[PDB]
Design a protein around this ligand. Structure first.
Ligand SMILES: Cc1ncc(COP(=O)(O)O)c(CNN[C@@](C)(Cc2ccc(O)c(O)c2)C(=O)O)c1O
Ligand SMILES: Cc1ncc(COP(=O)(O)O)c(CNN[C@@](C)(Cc2ccc(O)c(O)c2)C(=O)O)c1O
Lengths: 464, 464
């Protein structure tokens, strides 16, 4: 197809996209399709001659949609939200049209330059210490990573290279392999699985630190682990502090963990994938206190800041520490800040979102979700049959029917079978817990109310 | 902004995208902007209140465009092409609207299922051995990687885990670190830098194999290296054969290298980033012969198959070998086939491109570029002042002005300073060479002719 055809089809696609998101409430959130449903519905080979756009769109609706879990439905309360905003979609369109591969400055100056500024803009919205800002003379700076899982691996690799060099500077005949055997990384027992994958890929041992009563990593527990492992001849080199754990959105104590990592010269990476977005609101910023001790900080605007997926934000205090793993002020070589060499103009999404919503719009968005979260929490607190299982700070409420895990697993099955809303569970200290996460950009109090009524009703039937 | 605003702005964006690509020939390919030009032109902070869409679009045109290198201009003859097609853009739009994160089957069945089928469709277009196809009972299969650089690291990690397990089976006290010290990987001296990055990240030694007269890796040179390294107590575990090297688009000999890797039980990964797309044309398929010996095969539809960047295609013969590094028939867990956990619905781009162009349209596209490449080659062969430096098989012509490297470096500077076309050089055996790569989806004979006339003219002035 050509430009004139695109002008026509592109506009049709725009209406199709708007129609989908606009009438999404009428879709069943979770699909009834069985694994393997798709292959028999489409040809086993690509067509020799063109199919029409109309035919493809019909297939999207009749063959693809039945196998889609609608992340953006007001009734999707699973995992954590993923971002969807029209400004981000407009930027993605422009991004694909410009279509440059920013593997070097010369490949498209703006592809690299806009990103550094967007990262400073965002760094300021979060009130990050200046050490993380690029500005005109900063040693630090930020980069867009493809995802938090990748950001963590990047930080682990930078940390691995750094401690290897420190060990080798003092004892030159030491090999990389010999050093790997002694390296140990730590993360909370509530840390996301991306940390274990990073340890596995990095070839190092990863040890979980027992979390406290509020599922937070504490100085005492970290120190205990450090002493035991150093005594055994292991070398702590990397710690991942999680702000906004997946299970119950708890927060590791950065003010306690930071000083320890500093004293032991341990690389401290902060994973705030979900919660990070809330930090642009002054009332939640205290949760990030202690980030001044972090060597790297990361959160996903593609979760809770409306920047469509393919946008994880990472900052470091020393580009040299990051850069050393893959070989001030202005950044010209992002290829040394990430695993892949190529990259597309993703900073455009941030620019459009930040400018079209404005900081105030983004704050209102966060605050509304937190309000909705508390509305759901209030419902649960009013019913003596249920219990809230963890402090509710952001858009996640962990709850359960007072009773056995079997009862709650049954409640979850009833909810999934009903197909009205979609939630997922988790285990908090072996205990089965239901998670209610405010996800959709357009969830309203009504949806939360109906979701609660639906859940309360099923619970009643079950209790009988 | 809301759906109705998007219906309006999205359509405006469509026209803006079409206008840009349509009038791209009137843009200067390479920018005159200096590093750091952007920061002073935009605010140091995000706006508190919304900016208008009109204002953003004006900034795109006045502030962003001057810092963009136009990859899609008919006059961009640098590196290798990157993909840009309207069907791919249409799919990307849909992809962002559905906006699912396919980290598991349940997160969106179709996000995972369509991908496996598209990979089989593409596998069939390339006439890959059936061992690489998923089908209904295959052990192999394909996955979309974010890029070839990542695909190579994935294969290296799978290979690293495989040889480590084989070894610890013989010597169970052998640690991962002890094994890493003995591992050696190989690639041609013409291999892309992504291979060195993979070795660095994987913590293993990478050794370059001298290429022959046609810049191809040969059995003799590989064997020589293997014998020397095994004798030194090193363990070969991974070889990257490159089909379509960046410098001169040469091809490693798979028929020679394959048997050796098989006999030595060395993981053979095939990197065909650019050239891979040509293999859907029967007249170029012989270049891929020997892929039956490969453990993993990869090429980028986002280079030369019109699937907009963020689309690298990788196949393996044994999902178990790949999967083992991150832990038949239907694939439900792509999270064990790649580094990141999340992923978007990228298979949509393949589906739209394959269906809207049809195999025949894709083959016509490839053939036209190869024809244009030979047209340029013919021009060079007619002028006794120049020489072609390597066999021309696909869309790349390596040439130089007969004489010193200094003369050619001067010619390149003249070309870049003129700002009419954009090319990059490379060194072939220390010799400075100019590269002419057919890139744009809309390059025509006229463009190639004008580019040659422009180059010939500058060469004349210089020679005087
Ligand atoms: C605390 C924490 N750290 C890292 C990650 C990985 O982030 P990414 O997906 O960018 O690699 C997670 C993220 N996600 N875990 C979820 C919530 C799944 C999910 C929801 C929404 C998204 O946009 C993504 O990308 C993933 C879980 O269900 O496992 C995390 O929470
Ligand atoms: C032979 C070869 N192998 C691997 C790679 C890496 O691919 P990717 O960019 O997906 O990680 C390359 C690729 N690119 N090298 C180029 C041609 C730059 C480039 C051009 C067009 C693209 O779409 C991308 O992604 C990159 C370079 O000149 O170095 C490769 O050639």
């Amino acid at each position: 197809m050509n430009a004139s055809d695109f002008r026509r089809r592109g506009k049709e696609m725009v209406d199709y996209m708007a129609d989908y998101l606009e009438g999404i409430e009428g879709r069943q959130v979770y699909p009834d399709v069985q694994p393997g449903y798709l292959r028999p519905l489409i040809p086993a080979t690509a067509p020799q001659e063109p199919d029409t756009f109309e035919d493809i769109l019909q297939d999207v609706e009749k063959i693809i949609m039945p196998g889609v879990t609608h992340w953006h439905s007001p009734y999707f309360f699973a995992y954590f939200p993923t971002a969807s905003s029209y400004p981000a979609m407009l930027a993605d369109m422009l991004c694909g049209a410009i279509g440059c591969i920013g593997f070097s400055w010369a490949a498209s100056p703006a592809c690299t330059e806009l990103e550094t500024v967007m990262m400073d803009w965002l760094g300021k919205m979060l009130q990050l210490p200046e050490a993380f800002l690029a500005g005109e003379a900063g040693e630090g700076g930020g980069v867009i990573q493809g995802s938090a899982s990748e950001a963590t691996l990047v930080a682990l690799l930078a940390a691995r290279t750094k401690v290897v060099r420190r060990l080798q500077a003092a004892s030159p005949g030491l090999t990389q392999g010999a050093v790997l055997e002694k390296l140990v990384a730590y993360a909370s027992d509530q840390a996301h699985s991306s940390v274990e994958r990073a340890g596995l890929i990095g070839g190092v041992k990863l040890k979980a630190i027992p979390s406290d009563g509020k599922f937070a990593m504490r100085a005492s527990a970290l120190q205990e682990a450090l002493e035991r492992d150093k005594a055994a001849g292991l070398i702590p080199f990397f710690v991942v502090a999680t702000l906004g754990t997946t299970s119950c959105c708890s927060f590791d104590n950065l003010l306690e963990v930071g000083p320890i990592c500093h004293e032991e010269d341990i690389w401290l990476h902060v994973d705030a994938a979900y919660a990070g977005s809330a930090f642009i609101c002054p009332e939640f910023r205290h949760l990030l206190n202690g980030v001044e001790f972090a060597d790297s900080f990361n959160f996903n605007p593609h979760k809770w800041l409306l920047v469509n997926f393919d946008c994880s934000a990472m900052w470091v205090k020393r580009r040299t520490d990051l850069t050393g793993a893959f070989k001030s002020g202005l950044i010209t070589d992002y290829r040394h800040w990430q695993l892949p060499l190529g990259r597309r103009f993703r900073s455009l999404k941030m620019w459009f979102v930040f400018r079209m919503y404005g900081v105030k719009g983004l704050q209102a968005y966060i605050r509304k979700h937190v309000q909705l979260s508390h509305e759901f929490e209030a419902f649960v607190l009013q019913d003596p049959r249920f219990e809230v299982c963890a402090e509710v700070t952001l858009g996640l409420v962990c709850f359960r029917l007072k009773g056995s895990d079997g009862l709650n697993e049954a409640l979850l099955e009833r909810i999934n079978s009903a197909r009205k809303i979609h939630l997922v569970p988790c285990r908090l200290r072996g205990q089965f817990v239901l998670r209610f996460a405010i996800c959709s950009r357009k969830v309203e109090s009504g949806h939360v109310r109906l979701a609660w009524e639906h859940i309360r009703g099923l619970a009643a039937e079950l209790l009988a």
